[PDB]
Amino acid sequence: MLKYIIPTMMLMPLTWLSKNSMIWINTTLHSLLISLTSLLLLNQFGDNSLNFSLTFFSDSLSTPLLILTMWLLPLMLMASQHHLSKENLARKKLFISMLILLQLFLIMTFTATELIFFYIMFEATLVPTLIIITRWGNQTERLNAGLYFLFYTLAGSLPLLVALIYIQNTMGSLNFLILQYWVQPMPNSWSNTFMWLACMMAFMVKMPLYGLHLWLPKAHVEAPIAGSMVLAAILLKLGGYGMMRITLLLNPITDFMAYPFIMLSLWGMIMTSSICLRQTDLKSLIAYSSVSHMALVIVAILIQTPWSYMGATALMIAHGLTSSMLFCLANSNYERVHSRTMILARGLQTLLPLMAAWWLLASLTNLALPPSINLIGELFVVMSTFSWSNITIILMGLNMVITALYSLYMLITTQRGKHTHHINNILPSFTRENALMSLHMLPLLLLSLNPKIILGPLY
Amino acid sequence: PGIVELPSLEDLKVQEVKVSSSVLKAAAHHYGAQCDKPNKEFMLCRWEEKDPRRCLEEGKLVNQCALEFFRQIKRHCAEPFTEYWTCIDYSGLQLFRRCRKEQAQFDKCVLDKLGWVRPDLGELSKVTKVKTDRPLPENPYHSRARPEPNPEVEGDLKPARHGSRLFFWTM
Ligand SMILES: CCCCCCCCCCCCCCCCCC(=O)OC[C@H](COP(=O)([O-])OC[C@H](O)COP(=O)([O-])OC[C@H](COC(=O)CCCCCCCCCCCCCCCCC)OC(=O)CCCCCCCCCCCCCCCCC)OC(=O)CCCCCCCCCCCCCCCCC
Ligand SMILES: CCCCCCCCCCCCCCCCCC(=O)OC[C@H](COP(=O)([O-])OC[C@H](O)COP(=O)([O-])OC[C@H](COC(=O)CCCCCCCCCCCCCCCCC)OC(=O)CCCCCCCCCCCCCCCCC)OC(=O)CCCCCCCCCCCCCCCCC
Ligand SMILES: CCCCCCCCCCCCCCCCCC(=O)OC[C@H](COP(=O)([O-])OCC[N+](C)(C)C)OC(=O)CCCCCCCCCCCCCCCCC
């Protein structure tokens, strides 16, 4: 995996030696070349994983998250260059360096063969995200949101360090390839119960779980646009990736420890969607929608059936693209009205028709419109949870009702109605912004054509 | 532990040298010259056995030789010896330097009648050699069996198998 790590690090001399007007063009160009090269991770087999070295490997789960991670960096560079136009050049290069460094940490977080190196990279991804939020965030509450984002993740993950080093002492190795074959069944005890909690609660925070999600409508809102994109698209998916790696070691104790978290997530996908029905902040509406979608990924991981993992990884990739595009659309309003209040700017389809078409497509993919991979993930998780318990179809269908309701309420409020009279700075849509929306949506619509590359290790 | 094994009171009875310290100091150099051999057998037995219970016969030979020494003084040269140890006995620190004429009288009469020569400066402090017939003590400290040491290292130092083996560091 060194063939992606080395160009990602060579982005740093590429961004610290570029001209004062060239530091966006060159970084976008070469990160798009890295994203083109990221397709070579699709050499996957139906029995064996693509195993590179002692340090790095990539199965069919890590591969779509890797292509998504190496694709999201040019989109963050396009999104975050307008509000940093007035910025100092050195701080501009520092922002690009934090983005490049976060990509570097993520692409060797997903490919980490051994679990403590996964942990080191997984907690290494805090500090560029923390610096981006707390330094280039816009408002006063970026500092408190940085505190919440830091100290929920560390409070979840420092028990995970102790649990992983205990696995290193008991099994002899934290290699995932070794732990596929030396995995001992974990019986019922209190010690194995808190073993399970220390293994799971870090990723429960990072998904987020309902009740542990209070960091998210502050971190995803008070961030700048590139920070909100990477938080919505990759850093919620580190939790699902870590759960799918760590729940091998947690059988059969998962089959009764999963119940309180399954209740929390099945009820929180209703509660956060109802919250989205009464949000005045658009960026907070997209944040609580992200919690509402990742609750299904938590349930799909904890019921641990093959259909559930296929739906969970499709839902992760699809929600990454969709929620990143929704945050970029909210930025496209915020760069014109300078407020995140959803009831401020209305009637924008009269003024920005192509942008309203992008809003329409993103709101359709948010409410899981078939045959998108949003609906493929949503539907497969619904099938597997109906296999889990037949009564869960009530919660799943009521979540789908409220999800369609808040998605089209967002669409009708921002884009439809009569335009607000006292706002006269609604510029036309830039080529940069429409290109950003298209580079989100067009891969998402192309993945409906060949959806088998985003369906996990057990397609 | 074990019962300590003491000699009887009859094993300790010997005819004592019941003279004063100035009497012993007056004829000290002739005592070192003439009573050399049983005294050195005793002090070698005393520094080798490291036990006074293993030295009782040698101490009795010391006491017998000292008694014969003072009886051989008393028969021939009793009055210059009494004149000499009285003058030694007068002083508090009992100096030899204060009594050189009584010393000359005593040494003269002793050399003339008993043939004893007073040793020179340096002679009584010599480390001598002692011909004993008793065997050498094989374990005077009664030291038990020593603990066997830990095994030493041996063999050529091969490299570490797959490096440090520290979680993922392949070197
Ligand atoms: C690998 C090769 C693949 C080749 C085939 C391509 C496959 C599909 C690719 C994506 C297709 C959509 C692209 C256009 C929409 C986005 C841009 C836009 O809005 O432009 C408006 C504009 C036309 O409007 P305008 O008059 O100029 O101005 C806009 C108006 O002011 C105001 O605009 P508006 O709102 O009035 O009009 C927008 C209208 C609004 O209409 C809607 O929103 C209604 C759509 C939903 C209901 C109807 C469809 C339901 C599902 C049935 C169809 C799918 C299954 C069919 C199969 C059989 C049955 C199973 O939407 C459309 O007209 C889009 C038609 C296609 C819709 C596809 C589904 C989108 C819905 C959301 C996701 C649904 C699930 C995923 C489906 C994925 C299918 C592949 O279009 C363009 O200028 C198009 C430019 C070129 C687009 C290229 C797209 C492909 C790019 C990929 C590049 C790499 C691969 C190479 C292939 C290249 C092919 C050329
Ligand atoms: C006949 C005489 C002539 C013979 C000539 C032969 C050589 C020809 C080429 C000449 C150049 C040689 C260069 C070194 C050999 C290759 C080393 C290598 O790639 O190891 C793969 C190594 C393990 O992967 P592998 O596939 O198992 O091993 C492949 C080989 O067998 C690797 O071999 P190995 O198995 O023997 O490796 C042993 C072990 C293998 O590794 C392990 O066992 C895993 C543990 C490694 C450390 C993990 C620490 C994690 C926590 C801290 C993270 C820090 C932040 C990350 C970076 C942030 C940005 C600076 O290495 C270490 O543990 C060393 C520590 C890491 C340093 C790697 C060497 C760097 C040299 C250049 C420094 C330039 C700055 C680089 C960035 C600084 C951070 C690396 O990859 C990593 O650890 C990933 C991190 C990046 C490595 C650096 C890549 C080297 C080239 C960088 C060029 C671009 C620089 C851009 C500017 C500066 C940054 C902005
Ligand atoms: C995000 C905030 C909330 C975080 C919650 C994190 C999970 C909650 C539970 C964590 C427990 C602590 C780590 C356990 C690691 C288990 C590893 C192991 O070997 O276990 C078996 C071992 C068993 O011991 P052993 O393995 O040495 O024994 C040999 C094996 N037997 C048992 C067969 C003889 O368990 C323990 O030793 C104790 C486990 C419980 C520890 C209790 C103290 C911590 C209490 C919870 C703190 C929660 C966070 C507080 C901060 C919140 C925010 C401010």
Q: How many structural domains are present in chain A?
A: 1
What number of helices (H) and strands (E) belong to chain A? Answer: 21, 2
Query: Do B168 and A168 lie within an 8 Å CB cutoff?
Result: no
| Residue corresponding to tokens 């884009």 | A415
Q: Is A205 exposed, middle or buried (0-12, 13-18, 19+ CB in 10 A)?
A: buried
Ligand nearest to the CA of A120: 2
* Residue B160 DSSP label: P
**Which method resolved this structure?**
cryo-EM
Tokens of A46: 């139906």
Ligand nearest to the CA of A105: 2
Answer for the pair A72, A102: CB distance below 8 angstroms, yes or no: no
How far away, in angstroms, is A439 Cα from ligand 1 center? 13
How far away, in angstroms, is A159 Cα from ligand 3 center? 7
Ligand nearest to the CA of A10: 2
Which helix (H) or strand (E) segment holds residue B149: the answer is: none
Q: Residue A198 — φ and ψ, nearest 5°?
A: -65, -30
Tokens of B24: 């012993």
Query: Do A113 and B167 lie within an 8 Å CB cutoff?
Result: no
Tokens of A115: 């679990």
- Ligand 3: which atom is nearest the Cα of residue A163? 17
Within A255-312, strands assigned E span none
Which residues touch A222 (CB under 8 Å, ≥6 apart)?
Answer: A133, A137, A138, A139, A141, A142, A145
Resolution (A): 3.0
**Which residue's CA is minimally distant from atom 99 of ligand 2?**
A9
Query: Do A174 and B167 lie within an 8 Å CB cutoff?
Result: yes
- Structural domain harbouring A271: 1-459
Q: Is A406 exposed, middle or buried (0-12, 13-18, 19+ CB in 10 A)?
A: buried
- Rg (C-alpha) for chain A, rounded Å, is 21
Q: Which residues of chain B lie closer than 8 angstroms to A113, CB-CB? A: 168
* Residue A60 DSSP label: T
Query: Do A54 and B170 lie within an 8 Å CB cutoff?
Result: yes
Which helix (H) or strand (E) segment holds residue A440: the answer is: helix A431-446
Q: Does B169 touch chain A (CB under 8 A)?
A: no
How far away, in angstroms, is A441 Cα from ligand 1 center? 10
| Residue corresponding to tokens 């000359």 | B104
**What is the distance of C-alpha A375 from the center of its chain?**
17
Answer for the pair A138, A168: CB distance below 8 angstroms, yes or no: no
How many of the other CB atoms lie within 10 Å of CB of A428?
Answer: 11
Nearest to A433 by CA among A335, A289, A318: A335
Q: Which residues of chain A lie closer than 8 angstroms to B168, CB-CB? A: 54-55, 113-114, 116-117
Whole-angstrom distance, CA of residue A203 vs CA of residue A312:
14
Query: Do A114 and B167 lie within an 8 Å CB cutoff?
Result: yes
Burial A361-386 (b: 16+ CB within 10 A, else e): bbbbbbbbeeebbbbbbbbbbbbbbe
How far away, in angstroms, is A213 Cα from ligand 3 center? 22
Whole-angstrom distance, CA of residue A15 vs CA of residue A30:
10
- Rounded to the nearest 10 degrees, how much is the dihedral formed by the CA atoms of B158, B163, B165, B170? -160
A374-377 contacts, C-beta under 8 A, 24 or more apart = A374/A315, A374/A318, A374/A319, A374/A322, A374/A444, A376/A311, A376/A314, A376/A318, A376/A451, A377/A296, A377/A311, A377/A312, A377/A313, A377/A314, A377/A315, A377/A316, A377/A317, A377/A318, A377/A319
Whole-angstrom distance, CA of residue B171 vs CA of residue B166:
9
